[PDB]
């Protein structure tokens, strides 16, 4: 830190080397040998010396050596310019949309005009200016046309002229996103017309059109036959596609660019150029290569082994076709052969740096050399691997220990890795004396050294000296060196790690910020493994059992301030995602306070002293008082004596503060009071002045639960109070574990006899249930017995279907589960041998210690039924369960209902039904790791520029505002826990008040402002109370969006403020009213969202964090991350599951609402058909089909289908659809009837790629494939196994001249009952019907019942045995009667809290509008969020966004804060659209290096440089790649030092 | 304002800017049977004049395209027929804090 | 510190002129010299002293 930097760098320039590197690195190469015999590197060679020193040789270039040489470049001439791969494809647009003859474009030169002079607007801050552009409109001659000109270039120079005059635009230009957004929409538009022309604007004589190849060869066809004519007409007043040599396309393109100037000035740049250097065709062409310096290109080596580069490979075999092409040039100098190998020669000089560049874009063995590209792209190559993600330093990893014996905060360092982890200290005169010692004491003793560095930059190890050196040189730490360049510098002793340094402390998936925690550093012996507490295990997520953890150390002390303040455990209290606490005492702890602070624990004198000092020890700083003060004993006279809830009312006493009151609360412990007997509070909590008075302590007060002992003492008295009191806990019940133990046993387990007789007559009323439900589900009744032969007709029935047997596998299963709860409600409290204290069976789970009610009933009653994939036990074939049992056994044990318990074991038929429900969920554990991976990394990459600002706004890095305030009201998640817990603050005025203090902090913020306006906002809100929010007036803006609530007392959200009002008004309770707002309304200003805050990074992580516990299957809706991989990424126009919420009105009855849902609800002509009797006869082909339809009463009812409408689809639609059906079929009968036999089918079952998963690794353990994903971090998956990542991957078709333009194909070379006497009505229809379609000739349809219909086709004579069932059960499937468009059914659901709703599949909004006298069209919810986009506009769509990814949330119970959803969804139509994460959201973005961060990188990067694009450096993804210093939280300002003098 | 009912013929859509002072706003008043601007997830859109547009910016220290924007052709942007480069108001009910004051540029 | 200060941190040398790493050199200097850094295509060869 003693070497400062002054010039830095900020900002980054793309650009294109042009061919005079010949300035900067005339060393070139010619000889493509690389060394020669006896190991020399050869002059003019790939290894030469002025590239650099190699093979201890000195350096030409530099005089400098192997080492501190930093390399030099070198060029390869190419004789002749061969075009660059990566910018190929961005001249051949410019290439095939020029005219030779003009040599201009082929549009208009004034419609190139136009876009030449919008891209020049869009170049500065003003858009709208560049749409007024179009707006200047007035066989055209050619004294309008350049008029025409003069005043669209005179509206730009004032449009422009203006803008600057103002801040709206600066001579560098302005560029945003929204900027960027319109600037890609016409270059995208510009490379579009001009891709397709006829015929030049300027000239009549129009160029033949070109067609390319794998990128090496330029064809330029023959004009064909008819357009000569145009050459010839217009003009005068070989073979296919000959080749085109790469100095013919630079001439070409050299005067086309030299002629429009104008237009590539703007096409080329994004920002105003300033330079003004002309865009040239040689950026297209190499001239030269350059070579990298020696020290990037040195061999490469395994083991002995030293092979040859990969860069040295491709680069001679340039190097000698470059030779090859000079010299066989010399060969064609004296006059066939030798031009077809010259021709040749050019394909492969350019095939040659193809490969030097690209590895697929040249031809391969299986798998080619490695090109430059090549090198770059995935989560391997550079730009994810060694700048995202490098390797550090001051580093350790160990197995981590479990630990009651230290802090919370802190970690125990062995001596192994304290030894050699080293920080450097400056030596000053306040710690030489602690320095002195660590010199002496070498780095082998522990509170040591290891080096000190002089004050010239030199080290001096001190591990091979001795005590004499060493001492010696401590003793010359102070001593000025007598130079004057390095006066100011002084000495660094690298001390080892002692006690007071910290530690960031890593496990491994760090899948949100508390699993990075920084502890302090506890130095213990005799160890070899690092050592942790269990207060500790829920942030990280680790289980003590082989889990490594990273430690890393770091190395100044604007590190250690940061590790210790922003970073450290203490503030990791409440998680960010709901505010809950994730820090508390695990399992032992809690079921010993269930012991200590019980009614039975009474301690003597000498015990009560023990207890006290040995949780708590004024020597480490435990106690404030300097002195352990103690209580009165409770018991005086026959012996003094003191109870268990004294003991924490003494540790209490002694850690906080002397001077802030007690803590008063009242809560409830997990432990219901009949537990302890008759009339006892035991479940209330109470606190009274720090006193506990009441109740037990449990997991719900010193767990990792809210509103608890701990969770109030954080919010009372601090984060550190908090901490000491799960150490101090932490240390009382493990000492009081040492002194009285606590065990499990054998009778723990055991039921009474009483209790045990109990379930045996209630497991005796069991034996009958299996039968009364299949006989229930089957509709038999009055008890038929189980071998009933109608019955077991019956039971066979609901086997073979599976939307039946889940109907018997759900009546089944709630008629046992009724004899599950009966058993357990009568014998787990009241029925065991041990009663609650005594049994710590039951005392483990009633504690939250341990385990549940679950556990400990089929320990002790029975198991129950064994539910397989949501249903019950499988059945085979034969209608058995298991060889055991009969076929179609009614009984509840063969279904699975397992009567036997743990304790007295399971028979074997149900011991293997337990192994089936055992593996259900262990199928489950593969499917787990890769879900939510890469779903946080893409929102991670966009939300992570985006922070809170000073003016409380929430936005990106480049500036875009995204949010006004983070969340409507600026707080911060983990500040809100006691903000609305009005009542515990009432108790806790007192010791509230002297936290926020309000005496030194009234003079700096303004009190009387903002409460005036609130109260003017309050009552104007009063008024309109009632009005819709379309019709509430706006005069009355928020307080918040007026005044900023971290200065002005008062302004305060309208949520807080009238939770704030109904507390102060429902509530009469020496305190008065005044003096509660103007705490509550402090407490609100201290807890606010600091700027600089990274929200971005949060609400990211507090997504993707709690979606790796929502990986399971089904206990419809698309459910959970594929329902989240529609919303946050992909942007799904077409999700596959989509839903309308149709509320209908009050006045509608139920009656009404299930007839209106058959009257949208789709009905196809299958569901009104019983059967169809298909009498086929011949002598005419006379097909006969006649209809049986259901009764009419009965599908007017199901459907309200009139019968009408049957004659109106059948007569209409139906035959429309048969007789299309039957001229397909026959027209299939004459032209395709046989194959080829003897030629091979393509192949059968394997997949697209790679025929498996894995063929080694795809059966490891989940042992062993941990101890594979544990020793190296191997989170990531290669290919994530996704339809929506290939549908990311297919998507965005080539060209609409493609070889189908819009699929065409060939559309071409087409040309009982015995009934009679109808009517002269059913006569007539009839003649129409069969004069309107092709076979009818007979006709006819029930139209007194509804029941049939009936017609004739007589087909030709011809014709042959053709399948007419199947064509008519197709063509019925098919065929819809009645279908509202885009929706198939509606239903009518249960209703969740008042609300009458109905659920559509599918989205149609356009048409539920028609529907108001049953619907409130007012309220209609939907979840396809691309439909409510297109019809009700952007904010509606917004407001989706947030109520979807809520519904995958609270559907697994887990709470995500409102603030993080409401910030993802305000990202993702910040252009007004619905984008996602994913490489289409991320193209309109100001940020280059975090787009070729990303993936795609070589995409990105070429466009970068077409653009001419400055990197301002002010995304974080930019700033690590350039090493400047990020910008979100402590870099978001900047320090400056106070000098005295002038 | 020119309400149709089937479509305006292409040849008759270049005549919508013909006239540069003047707009011609054209709705299919299939889309006008329910007015979107009472619906529950739609907050309270008001325009802003330059006299508070300005006053905007400088409070929060924005260039015209760093706001949020809304679309030319949002269904709610041409209910109020904005021009582009008109700010928006919106006043929509949080979960978390009420009613909260935000806003959105027309480009 | 962790992907900076103690992964790689080189203090490199950058031109004011060309804004280039690669194209700087510490000149071999003349027996009387300090050696300096200069940079390479911002240079210019001694033969070109033309008026």
Same mark, same amino acid.
């Given at each position: 830190?003693?070497?400062?930097?002054?010039?830095?760098?900020?900002?980054?320039?793309?650009?294109?080397?042009?061919?005079?590197?010949?300035?900067?690195?005339?060393?070139?190469?010619?000889?493509?040998?690389?060394?020669?015999?006896?190991?020399?590197?050869?002059?003019?060679?790939?290894?030469?010396?002025?590239?650099?020193?190699?093979?201890?040789?000195?350096?030409?270039?530099?005089?400098?050596?192997?080492?501190?040489?930093?390399?030099?470049?070198?060029?390869?001439?190419?004789?002749?310019?061969?075009?660059?791969?990566?910018?190929?494809?961005?001249?051949?647009?410019?290439?095939?949309?020029?005219?030779?003859?003009?040599?201009?474009?082929?549009?208009?030169?004034?419609?190139?005009?136009?876009?030449?002079?919008?891209?020049?607007?869009?170049?500065?801050?003003?858009?709208?200016?560049?749409?007024?552009?179009?707006?200047?409109?007035?066989?055209?001659?050619?004294?309008?046309?350049?008029?025409?000109?003069? &005043?669209?270039?005179?509206?730009?120079?004032?449009?422009?002229?203006?803008?600057?005059?103002?801040?709206?635009?600066?001579?560098?230009?302005?560029?945003?996103?929204?900027?960027?957004?319109?600037?890609?929409?016409?270059?995208?538009?510009?490379?579009?017309?001009?891709?397709?022309?006829?015929?030049?604007?300027?000239?009549?004589?129009?160029?033949?059109?070109?067609?390319?190849?794998?990128?090496?060869?330029?064809?330029?066809?023959?004009?064909?036959?008819?357009?000569?004519?145009?050459?010839?007409?217009?003009?005068?007043?070989?073979?296919?596609?000959?080749?085109?040599?790469?100095?013919?396309?630079?001439?070409?393109?050299?005067?086309?660019?030299?002629?429009?100037?104008?237009?590539?000035?703007?096409?080329?740049?994004?920002?105003?150029?300033?330079?003004?250097?002309?865009?040239?065709?040689?950026?297209?062409?190499?001239?030269?290569?350059?070579?990298?310096?020696?020290?990037?290109?040195?061999?490469?080596?395994?083991?002995?082994?030293?092979?040859?580069?990969?860069?040295?490979?491709?680069?001679?075999?340039?190097?000698?076709?470059?030779?090859?092409?000079?010299?066989?040039?010399?060969?064609?100098?004296?006059?066939?052969?030798?031009?077809?190998?010259?021709?040749?020669?050019?394909?492969?000089?350019?095939?040659?740096?193809?490969?030097?560049?690209?590895?697929?874009?040249?031809?391969?063995?299986?798998?080619?050399?490695?090109?430059?590209?090549? #090198?770059?792209?995935?989560?391997?190559?550079?730009?994810? &691997?060694?700048?995202?993600?490098?390797?550090?330093?001051?580093?350790?990893?160990?197995?981590?220990?479990?630990?009651?014996?230290?802090?919370?905060?802190?970690?125990?360092?062995?001596?192994?890795?304290?030894?050699?982890?080293?920080?450097?200290?400056?030596?000053?005169?306040?710690?030489?004396?602690?320095?002195?010692?660590?010199?002496?004491?070498?780095?082998?003793?522990?509170?040591?050294? /290891?080096?000190?560095?002089?004050?010239?930059?030199?080290?001096?190890?001190?591990?091979?000296?001795?005590?004499?050196?060493?001492?010696?040189?401590?003793?010359?730490?102070?001593?000025?060196?007598?130079?004057?360049?390095?006066?100011?510098?002084?000495?660094?002793?690298?001390?080892?790690?002692?006690?007071?340094?910290?530690?960031?402390?890593?496990?491994?998936?760090?899948?949100?910020?508390?699993?990075?925690?920084?502890?302090?550093?506890?130095?213990?012996?005799?160890?070899?493994?690092?050592?942790?507490?269990?207060?500790?295990?829920?942030?990280?997520?680790?289980?003590?059992?082989?889990?490594?953890?990273?430690?890393?150390?770091?190395?100044?002390?604007?590190?250690?301030?940061?590790?210790?303040?922003?970073?450290?455990?203490?503030?990791?209290?409440? /998680?960010?995602?709901?505010?809950?606490?994730?820090?508390?005492?695990?399992?032992?702890?809690?079921?010993?306070?269930?012991?200590?602070?019980?009614?039975?624990?009474?301690?003597?004198?000498?015990?009560?002293?023990?207890?006290?000092?040995?949780?708590?020890?004024?020597?480490?700083?435990?106690?404030?008082?300097?002195?352990?003060?103690?209580?009165?004993?409770?018991?005086?006279?026959?012996?003094?004596? %003191?109870?268990?809830?004294?003991?924490? /009312?003494?540790?209490?006493?002694?850690?906080?503060?002397?001077?802030?009151?007690?803590?008063?609360?009242?809560?409830?412990?997990?432990?219901?009071?009949?537990? %302890?007997?008759?009339?006892?509070?035991?479940? *209330?909590?109470?606190?009274?002045?720090?006193?506990?008075?009441?109740?037990?302590?449990?997991?719900?007060?010193?767990?990792?639960?809210?509103?608890?002992?701990?969770?109030?003492?954080?919010?009372?008295?601090?984060?550190?109070?908090?901490?000491?009191?799960?150490?101090?806990?932490?240390?009382?019940?493990?000492?009081?574990?040492?002194?009285?133990?606590?065990?499990?046993?054998?009778?723990?387990?055991?039921?009474?006899? *009483?209790?045990?007789?109990?379930?045996?007559?209630?497991?005796?009323?069991?034996?009958?249930?299996?039968?009364?439900?299949?006989?229930?589900?089957?509709?038999?009744?009055?008890?038929?017995?189980?071998?009933?032969?109608?019955?077991?007709?019956?039971?066979?029935?609901?086997?073979?279907?599976?939307?039946?047997?889940?109907?018997?596998?759900?009546?089944?299963?709630?008629?046992?589960? #009724?004899?599950?709860?009966?058993?357990?409600?009568?014998?787990?409290?009241?029925?065991?041998?041990?009663?609650?204290?005594?049994?710590?069976?039951?005392?483990? #789970?009633?504690?939250?210690?341990?385990?549940?009610?679950?556990?400990?009933?089929?320990?002790?009653?029975?198991?129950?039924?064994?539910?397989?994939?949501?249903?019950?036990?499988?059945?085979?074939?034969?209608?058995?369960?298991?060889?055991?049992?009969?076929?179609?056994?009614?009984?509840?044990?063969?279904?699975?209902?397992?009567?036997?318990?743990?304790?007295?074991?399971?028979?074997?038929?149900?011991?293997?039904?337990?192994?089936?429900?055992?593996?259900?969920?262990?199928?489950?554990?593969?499917?787990?790791?890769?879900?939510?991976?890469?779903?946080?990394?893409?929102?991670?990459?966009?939300?992570?520029?985006?922070?809170?600002?000073?003016?409380?706004?929430?936005?990106?890095?480049?500036?875009?505002?995204?949010?006004?305030?983070?969340?409507?009201?600026?707080?911060?998640?983990?500040?809100?826990?006691?903000?609305?817990?009005?009542?515990?603050?009432?108790?806790?005025?007192?010791?509230?008040?002297?936290?926020?203090?309000?005496?030194?902090?009234?003079?700096?913020?303004?009190?009387?402002?903002?409460?005036?306006?609130?109260?003017? /906002?309050?009552?104007?809100?009063?008024?309109?109370?009632?009005?819709?929010?379309?019709?509430?007036?706006?005069?009355?803006?928020?307080?918040?969006?007026?005044?900023?609530?971290?200065?002005?007392?008062?302004?305060?959200?309208?949520?807080?403020?009238?939770?704030?009002?109904?507390?102060?008004?429902?509530?009469?309770?020496?305190?008065?009213?005044?003096?509660?707002?103007?705490?509550?309304?402090?407490?609100?200003?201290?807890?606010?969202?600091?700027?600089?805050?990274?929200?971005?990074?949060?609400?990211?992580?507090?997504?993707?964090?709690?979606?790796?516990?929502?990986?399971?299957?089904?206990?419809?809706?698309?459910?959970?991350?594929?329902?989240?991989?529609?919303?946050?990424?992909?942007?799904?126009?077409?999700?596959?599951?989509?839903?309308?919420?149709?509320?209908?009105?009050?006045?509608?009855?139920?009656?009404?609402?299930?007839?209106?849902?058959? @009257?949208?609800?789709?009905?196809?002509?299958?569901?009104?058909?019983?059967?169809?009797?298909?009498?086929?006869?011949?002598?005419?082909?006379?097909?006969?089909?006649?209809?049986?339809?259901?009764?009419?009463?009965?599908?007017?009812?199901?459907?309200?289908?009139?019968?009408?409408?049957?004659?109106?689809?059948?007569?209409?639609?139906?035959?429309?659809?048969?007789?299309?059906?039957?001229?397909?079929?026959?027209?299939?009968?004459?032209?395709?009837?046989?194959?080829?036999?003897?030629?091979?089918?393509?192949?059968?079952?394997?997949?697209?790629?790679?025929?498996?998963?894995?063929?080694?690794?795809? *059966?490891?353990?989940?042992?062993?494939?941990? $101890?594979?994903? &544990?020793?190296?971090?191997?989170? $990531?998956?290669?290919?994530?196994?996704?339809?929506?990542?290939?549908?990311?991957?297919?998507?965005?078709?080539?060209?609409?001249?493609?070889?189908?333009?819009?699929?065409?194909?060939?559309?071409?070379?087409?040309?009982?009952?015995?009934?009679?006497?109808?009517? &002269?009505?059913?006569?007539?229809?009839?003649?129409?019907?069969?004069?309107?379609?092709?076979?009818?000739?007979?006709?006819?349809?029930?139209?007194?019942?509804?029941? %049939?219909?009936?017609?004739?086709?007589?087909? #030709?004579?011809?014709?042959?045995?053709?399948?007419?069932?199947?064509?008519?059960?197709?063509?019925?499937?098919?065929?819809?009667?009645?279908?509202?468009?885009?929706?198939?059914?509606?239903?009518?659901?249960?209703?969740?809290?008042?609300?009458?709703?109905?659920?559509?599949?599918?989205?149609?909004?356009?048409?539920?509008?028609?529907?108001?006298?049953?619907?409130?069209?007012?309220?209609?919810?939907?979840?396809?969020?691309?439909?409510?986009?297109?019809?009700?506009?952007?904010?509606?769509?917004?407001?989706?966004?947030?109520?979807?990814?809520?519904?995958?949330?609270?559907?697994?119970?887990?709470?995500?804060?409102?603030?993080?959803?409401?910030?993802?969804?305000?990202?993702?139509?910040?252009?007004?659209?619905?984008?996602?994460?994913?490489?289409?959201?991320?193209?309109?973005?100001?940020?280059?290096?975090?787009?070729?961060?990303?993936?795609?990188?070589?995409?990105?990067?070429?466009?970068?440089?077409?653009?001419?694009?400055?990197?301002?450096?002010? @995304?974080?993804?930019?700033?690590?790649?350039?090493?400047?210093?990020?910008?979100?939280?402590?870099?978001?300002?900047?320090?400056?030092?106070?000098?005295?003098?002038? | 304002?020119?309400?149709?009912?089937?479509?305006?013929?292409?040849?008759?859509?270049?005549?919508?800017?013909?006239?540069?002072?003047?707009?011609?706003?054209?709705?299919?008043?299939?889309?006008?049977?329910?007015?979107?601007?009472?619906?529950?997830?739609?907050?309270?859109?008001?325009?802003?004049?330059?006299?508070?547009?300005?006053?905007?910016?400088?409070?929060?220290?924005?260039?015209?395209?760093?706001?949020?924007?809304?679309?030319?052709?949002?269904?709610?942007?041409?209910?109020?027929?904005?021009?582009?480069?008109?700010?928006?108001?919106?006043?929509?009910?949080?979960?978390?804090?009420?009613?909260?004051?935000?806003?959105?540029?027309?480009? | 510190?962790?992907?900076?200060?103690?992964?790689?941190?080189?203090?490199?040398?950058?031109?004011?002129?060309?804004?280039?790493?690669?194209?700087?050199?510490?000149?071999?200097?003349?027996?009387?010299?300090?050696?300096?850094?200069?940079?390479?295509?911002?240079?210019?060869?001694?033969?070109?002293?033309?008026?």
């Amino acid at each position: 830190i003693s070497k400062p930097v002054g010039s830095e760098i900020t900002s980054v320039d793309f650009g294109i080397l042009t061919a005079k590197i010949r300035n900067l690195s005339a060393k070139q190469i010619t000889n493509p040998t690389v060394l020669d015999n006896l190991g020399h590197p050869v002059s003019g060679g790939l290894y030469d010396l002025a590239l650099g020193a190699f093979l201890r040789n000195l350096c030409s270039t530099c005089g400098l050596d192997e080492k501190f040489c930093p390399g030099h470049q070198g060029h390869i001439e190419l004789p002749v310019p061969c075009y660059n791969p990566l910018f190929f494809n961005q001249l051949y647009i410019y290439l095939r949309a020029s005219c030779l003859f003009c040599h201009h474009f082929r549009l208009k030169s004034v419609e190139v005009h136009r876009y030449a002079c919008k891209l020049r607007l869009l170049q500065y801050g003003l858009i709208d200016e560049s749409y007024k552009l179009d707006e200047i409109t007035l066989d055209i001659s050619s004294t309008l046309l350049n008029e025409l000109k003069s &005043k669209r270039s005179e509206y730009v120079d004032m449009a422009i002229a203006k803008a600057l005059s103002d801040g709206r635009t600066t001579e560098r230009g302005s560029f945003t996103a929204t900027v960027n957004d319109e600037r890609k929409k016409l270059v995208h538009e510009f490379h579009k017309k001009l891709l397709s022309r006829g015929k030049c604007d300027n000239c009549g004589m129009f160029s033949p059109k070109f067609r390319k190849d794998g990128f090496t060869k330029i064809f330029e066809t023959a004009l064909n036959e008819k357009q000569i004519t145009n050459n010839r007409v217009k003009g005068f007043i070989k073979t296919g596609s000959t080749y085109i040599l790469s100095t013919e396309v630079k001439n070409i393109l050299d005067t086309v660019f030299r002629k429009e100037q104008c237009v590539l000035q703007y096409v080329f740049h994004s920002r105003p150029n300033l330079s003004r250097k002309l865009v040239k065709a040689d950026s297209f062409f190499m001239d030269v290569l350059v070579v990298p310096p020696t020290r990037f290109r040195l061999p490469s080596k395994l083991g002995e082994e030293v092979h040859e580069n990969s860069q040295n490979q491709l680069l001679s075999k340039v190097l000698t076709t470059s030779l090859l092409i000079r010299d066989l040039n010399d060969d064609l100098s004296k006059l066939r052969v030798i031009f077809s190998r010259l021709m040749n020669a050019f394909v492969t000089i350019q095939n040659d740096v193809n490969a030097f560049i690209d590895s697929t874009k040249a031809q391969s063995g299986k798998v080619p050399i490695p090109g430059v590209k090549q #090198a770059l792209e995935k989560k391997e190559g550079l730009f994810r &691997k060694h700048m995202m993600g490098k390797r550090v330093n001051y580093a350790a990893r160990s197995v981590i220990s479990p630990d009651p014996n230290i802090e919370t905060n802190e970690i125990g360092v062995p001596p192994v890795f304290a030894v050699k982890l080293t920080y450097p200290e400056p030596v000053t005169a306040y710690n030489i004396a602690e320095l002195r010692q660590a010199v002496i004491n070498g780095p082998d003793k522990w509170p040591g050294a /290891t080096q000190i560095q002089n004050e010239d930059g030199s080290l001096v190890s001190l591990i091979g000296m001795s005590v004499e050196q060493r001492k010696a040189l401590a003793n010359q730490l102070l001593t000025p060196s007598s130079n004057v360049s390095t006066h100011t510098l002084n000495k660094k002793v690298y001390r080892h790690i002692k006690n007071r340094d910290v530690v960031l402390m890593n496990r491994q998936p760090t899948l949100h910020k508390a699993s990075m925690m920084g502890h302090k550093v506890r130095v213990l012996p005799n160890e070899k493994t690092l050592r942790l507490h269990y207060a500790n295990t829920g942030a990280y997520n680790a289980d003590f059992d082989g889990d490594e953890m990273n430690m890393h150390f770091p190395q100044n002390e604007n590190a250690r301030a940061e590790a210790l303040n922003l970073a450290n455990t203490d503030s990791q209290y409440l /998680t960010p995602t709901s505010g809950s606490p994730v820090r508390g005492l695990i399992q032992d702890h809690i079921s010993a306070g269930v012991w200590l602070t019980s009614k039975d624990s009474f301690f003597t004198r000498e015990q009560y002293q023990q207890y006290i000092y040995g949780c708590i020890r004024p020597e480490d700083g435990h106690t404030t008082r300097s002195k352990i003060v103690t209580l009165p004993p409770t018991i005086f006279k026959p012996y003094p004596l %003191w109870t268990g809830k004294q003991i924490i /009312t003494t540790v209490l006493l002694n850690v906080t503060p002397p001077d802030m009151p007690g803590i008063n609360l009242i809560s409830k412990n997990k432990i219901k009071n009949e537990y %302890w007997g008759k009339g006892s509070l035991e479940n *209330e909590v109470l606190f009274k002045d720090g006193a506990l008075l009441c109740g037990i302590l449990d997991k719900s007060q010193y767990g990792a639960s809210k509103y608890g002992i701990v969770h109030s003492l954080h919010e009372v008295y601090g984060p550190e109070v908090a901490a000491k009191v799960l150490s101090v806990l932490g240390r009382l019940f493990t000492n009081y574990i040492t002194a009285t133990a606590f065990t499990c046993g054998m009778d723990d387990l055991r039921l009474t006899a *009483e209790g045990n007789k109990w379930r045996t007559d209630i497991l005796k009323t069991s034996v009958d249930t299996g039968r009364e439900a299949a006989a229930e589900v089957t509709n038999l009744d009055k008890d038929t017995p189980a071998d009933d032969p109608e019955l077991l007709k019956r039971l066979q029935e609901i086997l073979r279907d599976n939307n039946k047997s889940g109907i018997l596998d759900a009546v089944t299963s709630s008629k046992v589960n #009724a004899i599950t709860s009966q058993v357990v409600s009568k014998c787990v409290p009241d029925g065991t041998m041990k009663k609650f204290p005594c049994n710590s069976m039951q005392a483990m #789970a009633l504690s939250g210690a341990k385990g549940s009610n679950v556990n400990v009933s089929q320990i002790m009653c029975l198991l129950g039924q064994q539910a397989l994939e949501g249903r019950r036990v499988p059945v085979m074939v034969s209608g058995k369960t298991l060889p055991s049992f009969k076929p179609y056994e009614t009984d509840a044990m063969a279904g699975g209902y397992v009567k036997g318990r743990f304790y007295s074991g399971i028979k074997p038929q149900e011991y293997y039904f337990h192994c089936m429900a055992g593996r259900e969920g262990l199928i489950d554990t593969a499917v787990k790791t890769s879900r939510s991976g890469y779903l946080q990394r893409c929102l991670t990459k966009q939300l992570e520029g985006v922070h809170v600002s000073y003016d409380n706004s929430i936005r990106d890095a480049d500036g875009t505002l995204v949010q006004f305030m983070y969340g409507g009201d600026a707080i911060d998640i983990t500040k809100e826990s006691h903000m609305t817990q009005f009542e515990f603050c009432l108790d806790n005025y007192y010791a509230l008040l002297k936290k926020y203090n309000p005496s030194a902090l009234i003079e700096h913020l303004d009190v009387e402002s903002a409460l005036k306006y609130s109260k003017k /906002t309050l009552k104007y809100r009063k008024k309109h109370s009632k009005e819709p929010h379309y019709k509430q007036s706006v005069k009355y803006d928020p307080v918040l969006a007026k005044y900023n609530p971290a200065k002005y007392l008062g302004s305060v959200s309208e949520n807080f403020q009238d939770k704030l009002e109904s507390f102060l008004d429902k509530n009469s309770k020496g305190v008065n009213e005044k003096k509660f707002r103007a705490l509550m309304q402090l407490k609100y200003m201290r807890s606010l969202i600091n700027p600089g805050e990274a929200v971005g990074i949060i609400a990211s992580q507090s997504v993707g964090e709690p979606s790796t516990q929502m990986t399971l299957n089904t206990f419809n809706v698309t459910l959970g991350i594929p329902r989240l991989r529609e919303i946050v990424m992909t942007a799904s126009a077409a999700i596959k599951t989509p839903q309308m919420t149709l509320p209908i009105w009050n006045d509608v009855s139920d009656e009404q609402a299930d007839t209106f849902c058959k @009257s949208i609800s789709k009905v196809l002509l299958s569901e009104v058909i019983d059967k169809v009797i298909v009498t086929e006869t011949t002598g005419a082909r006379s097909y006969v089909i006649h209809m049986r339809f259901f009764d009419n009463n009965e599908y007017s009812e199901e459907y309200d289908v009139s019968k009408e409408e049957l004659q109106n689809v059948i007569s209409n639609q139906f035959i429309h659809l048969l007789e299309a059906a039957i001229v397909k079929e026959i027209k299939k009968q004459k032209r395709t009837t046989g194959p080829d036999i003897g030629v091979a089918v393509p192949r059968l079952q394997t997949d697209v790629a790679n025929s498996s998963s894995n063929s080694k690794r795809l *059966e490891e353990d989940n042992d062993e494939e941990q $101890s594979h994903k &544990k020793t190296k971090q191997a989170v $990531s998956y290669d290919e994530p196994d996704e339809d929506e990542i290939e549908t990311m991957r297919e998507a965005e078709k080539s060209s609409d001249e493609e070889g189908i333009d819009s699929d065409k194909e060939s559309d071409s070379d087409s040309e009982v009952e015995a009934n009679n006497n109808m009517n &002269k009505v059913q006569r007539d229809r009839q003649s129409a019907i069969i004069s309107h379609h092709r076979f009818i000739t007979k006709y006819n349809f029930d139209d007194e019942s509804g029941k %049939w219909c009936e017609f004739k086709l007589e087909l #030709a004579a011809d014709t042959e045995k053709l399948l007419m069932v199947n064509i008519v059960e197709e063509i019925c499937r098919k065929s819809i009667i009645r279908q509202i468009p885009h929706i198939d059914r509606c239903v009518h659901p249960e209703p969740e809290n008042g609300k009458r709703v109905l659920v559509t599949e599918g989205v149609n909004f356009q048409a539920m509008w028609d529907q108001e006298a049953f619907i409130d069209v007012d309220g209609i919810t939907s979840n396809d969020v691309a439909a409510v986009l297109k019809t009700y506009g952007v904010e509606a769509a917004r407001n989706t966004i947030v109520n979807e990814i809520n519904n995958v949330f609270s559907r697994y119970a887990i709470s995500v804060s409102f603030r993080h959803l409401d910030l993802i969804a305000d990202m993702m139509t910040r252009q007004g659209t619905y984008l996602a994460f994913n490489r289409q959201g991320m193209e309109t973005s100001t940020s280059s290096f975090m787009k070729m961060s990303y993936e795609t990188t070589c995409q990105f990067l070429t466009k970068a440089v077409l653009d001419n694009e400055r990197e301002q450096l002010d @995304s974080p993804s930019a700033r690590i790649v350039v090493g400047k210093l990020n910008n979100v939280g402590t870099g978001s300002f900047d320090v400056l030092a106070k000098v005295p003098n002038a | 304002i020119f309400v149709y009912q089937n479509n305006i013929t292409p040849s008759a859509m270049k005549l919508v800017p013909s006239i540069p002072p003047a707009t011609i706003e054209t709705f299919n008043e299939a889309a006008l049977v329910v007015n979107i601007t009472h619906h529950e997830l739609v907050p309270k859109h008001i325009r802003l004049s330059s006299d508070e547009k300005r006053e905007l910016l400088k409070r929060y220290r924005l260039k015209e395209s760093q706001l949020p924007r809304i679309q030319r052709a949002d269904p709610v942007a041409l209910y109020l027929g904005l021009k582009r480069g008109e700010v928006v108001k919106i006043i929509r009910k949080s979960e978390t804090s009420g009613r909260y004051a935000s806003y959105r540029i027309c480009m | 510190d962790r992907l900076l200060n103690s992964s790689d941190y080189t203090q490199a040398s950058v031109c004011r002129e060309c804004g280039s790493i690669l194209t700087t050199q510490q000149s071999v200097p003349r027996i009387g010299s300090i050696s300096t850094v200069c940079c390479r295509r911002c240079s210019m060869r001694f033969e070109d002293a033309k008026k």
